[PDB]
Amino acid sequence: GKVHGSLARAGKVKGQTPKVPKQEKKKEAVGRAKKRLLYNKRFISAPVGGKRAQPNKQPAGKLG
Amino acid sequence: VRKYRNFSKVYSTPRRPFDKERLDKELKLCGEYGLRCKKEVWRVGAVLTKMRSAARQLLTLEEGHLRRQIEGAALLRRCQKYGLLDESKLKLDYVLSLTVPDFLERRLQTIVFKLGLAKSIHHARVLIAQRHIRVGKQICTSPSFLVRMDSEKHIDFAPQSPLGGGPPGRVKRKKLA
């Protein structure tokens, strides 16, 4: 911190971020079809001991 | 201004919107009975809540009180003609054992799926929404139609639909022509 916050720094990070575009967009399920997807992914695809693995389990990264 | 027609809400949003128990149970029954959102569950739950609260306030009375006679006879006749309660369990304590599945299987979707008209419950909902199915003679097209015990034996395909005795739909009409 040679210089701290000021009015000249508004938008610094949002202007710095390298702007990775978004991917190809295969369309999302809505309504009954999404309820079906969730019911299947949760309650029948079930390893019955750990109970109900959490959905957003991410691979092993720098922190482990 | 002077439009005196009524409207109302059929369901109530639960407190504690992020409880694991209620979320997983609601999703379980939604996937089991082919439901598009949680409000389809909460309206059945509100109907059940009204029925059970009426049953409770009636059971708080004796037998022979005018309220008991009229409203309890009405509740039992309702829960009978809609296949919630059978001839055996036709009492105000058995109407308190009502569960949301007790209405979700009365739901027209589940009935045309159990009658083998459709392969899966989602296929059933698709049929009803695409108006292939009559209840009695009327083409019903709302999958939440609460099929009474009487009109349960008159469910059938519609004569206007290709499934049954109707003309070919778009794709078969084109494939032939």
Place this chain on the structure above:
Amino acid sequence: GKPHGIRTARKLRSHRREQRWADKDYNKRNLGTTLKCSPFGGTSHVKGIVLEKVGVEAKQPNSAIRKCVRVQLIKNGKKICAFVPKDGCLNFIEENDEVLVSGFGRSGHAVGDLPGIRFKVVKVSGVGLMALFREKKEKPR
């Protein structure tokens, strides 16, 4: 203790009525000085003119500079200091640009780091600030 006894209704009611004035919520709701003194004269949103930009140093243990604008309200002339929410967004605001301001989510009090700043900006020049942030719309001229 309170008077029991079947003819103490007036005492009980008068005591409750004179004692309700110690509930600060009821007190501010019924005391007609907030409609007078508060800049939002009993109102969710107001429109104002951006007078100046302000960098407000965040309270300990935090050390940012919150971007606010001093706004002059069209309906009563009063000057307030609204906060400009989201990254940048203050580059979507120059002087004289008319802006709509709301309260924060606390009904007259400041949230988090902001000292004494208890309003925020919702739309500048008739277009939502979050719309401009996520490039849904563009600022006029």
Place this chain on the structure above:
RNA sequence: AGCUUGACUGUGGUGUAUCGGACCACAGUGGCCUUGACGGGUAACGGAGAAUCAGGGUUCGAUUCCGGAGAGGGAGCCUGAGAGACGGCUACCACUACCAAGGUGGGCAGCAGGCACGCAAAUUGCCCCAUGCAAAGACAGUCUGUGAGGCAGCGACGAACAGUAGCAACCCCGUCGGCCUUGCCGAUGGGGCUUGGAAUGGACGCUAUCCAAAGACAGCCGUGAGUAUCAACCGGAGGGCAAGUCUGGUGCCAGCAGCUGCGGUAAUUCCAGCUCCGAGGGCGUAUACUAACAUUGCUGCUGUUAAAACACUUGUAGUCUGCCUAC
């Protein structure tokens, strides 16, 4: 904390449709008040009702039905059964329109519409078809009127019901059950990819139907969907609180964050990408109020030290007050 001087009562009149200090003439000195008079305030039109509500209660009710008041502010009237009328008149005030300058006018808090004011609210539409009302008047010959009212347009206020896909074959996956030492085979079953036979709604069409006339709905044995491009979103992912110790950038900066907190070069919280969670044709935000709240406590709070027993007696209003009276 005192209020009232036609103020309160009486007698005789007046006036009125009628009782009455309603007004008058003469007499008297009354009338209300800590059970809050008089005054002040309006996040005051009132009620039916609305939202919650175990119970007790809390908050709101401009708004459709009933009552009141008003028609720019006042006031005075005529006509009439009925008006102190305003789509009646008269005058003054405040604004204002036309003018040939002598004169004439105005009244949307009716319906559309415009300017202002604002956070904030629609078409200068069609019609009397229905509901009613009025009149010298059933209908037709021979068009009663009706911005009441109806129907349309705009309308994510707010409600209800549906769709945004379904079934099966190919290829990679899991549980069960066999053969068998584990491994292999079959069976429902689930994800992603290709391929099939179908299905259907939107959208357009109809003078069929609907309609006062149209438009839309319903109907169609009229066409016709594959990236079914006819392509869902709004918020989130440390905790409360469902969901990532993922990857890149940032480096107490930018910013997030209702609260706690995150950010100081390895950010589960910022900016994004991917993934996931929640409600879903909706979701977020702000404001107000309700519940949570037994944090206004009648039910039902607390007062030694958390907020709170008057320094202490007395004492009026107020509140509360021992036992007893027929087989």
Place this chain on the structure above:
RNA sequence: AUCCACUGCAGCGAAGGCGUUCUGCAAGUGCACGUCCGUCGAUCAAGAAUGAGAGUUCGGGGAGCAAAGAUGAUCAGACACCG
């Protein structure tokens, strides 16, 4: 001016408060009782009477102590503790 020791898990007073001896004046509680009255009571906004010390007012008094002030130390300062 003040009443040491006695002087205390002592007493009294509504509280504040009250301590040498003799004495004037009115009073209170408690106790004792086959005394009298016969509900006349409890708590109390308003109201009223007492209310340490400081403070003020008018007239005296002034020993001791002592705000202010003076003043010597201490201290970096010290119109603070201490004298």
Place this chain on the structure above:
RNA sequence: AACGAGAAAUCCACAGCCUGUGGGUUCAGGGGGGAGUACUGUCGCAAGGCUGAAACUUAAAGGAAUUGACGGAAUGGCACCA
């Protein structure tokens, strides 16, 4: 010194008989500040008493108790890094 009560300290002829909540009555409190402030009223010679807000600000203030640390606190041991 029991039961009970209490967040506990503690209370104990009460701070018990309280969610198994109601004998009667008065006063006061509603997070912390701003503030016992301003204005006004009233009493006083005055000092001031009584009465008494709001704008605004803030996520803790606070109470009892615990474990450690500290003490120019006490007691008792000790060390030629005293």
Place this chain on the structure above:
RNA sequence: GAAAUUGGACGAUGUCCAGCCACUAGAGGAAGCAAAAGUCGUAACAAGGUUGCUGUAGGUGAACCUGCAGCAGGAUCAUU
């Protein structure tokens, strides 16, 4: 039977006066609050280095100091 005449009432409206309320400008004075790293002290928390605090009075750069009386919420539940 019109204009005109006289005159009682109702009473708009103008002007003045009084009271009250609401909003508002103001030189200057004085407070409150908020904002990482400005100055002077060390008043409090331990016996906080003069135990602390209450009421009042006086003094003082500022915290504060001192007097009188009280309190322990004290650093004493305790000595013919």
Place this chain on the structure above:
RNA sequence: GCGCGGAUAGCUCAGUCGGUAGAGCAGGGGAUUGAAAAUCCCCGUGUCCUUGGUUCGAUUCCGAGUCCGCGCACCA
């Protein structure tokens, strides 16, 4: 109304009278820090009003001369 003072890096300012240049503030880079804050190093930066003769260069010599402050003063 007559008469007196100085403009020096982006700002506050001491300048060898008649040899031509400097500090803090101001930004960056480094050292320090876990990151800062204070600190220490390194790097920026100036026709000194407009001008005339110009001693050798006029910043320092004089006079006109923006901008901004101030004292002197008439009597009976």
Place this chain on the structure above:
RNA sequence: CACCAUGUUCAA
């Protein structure tokens, strides 16, 4: 019982 004042911000 001479005198013995002080310790920048967040973080732990």
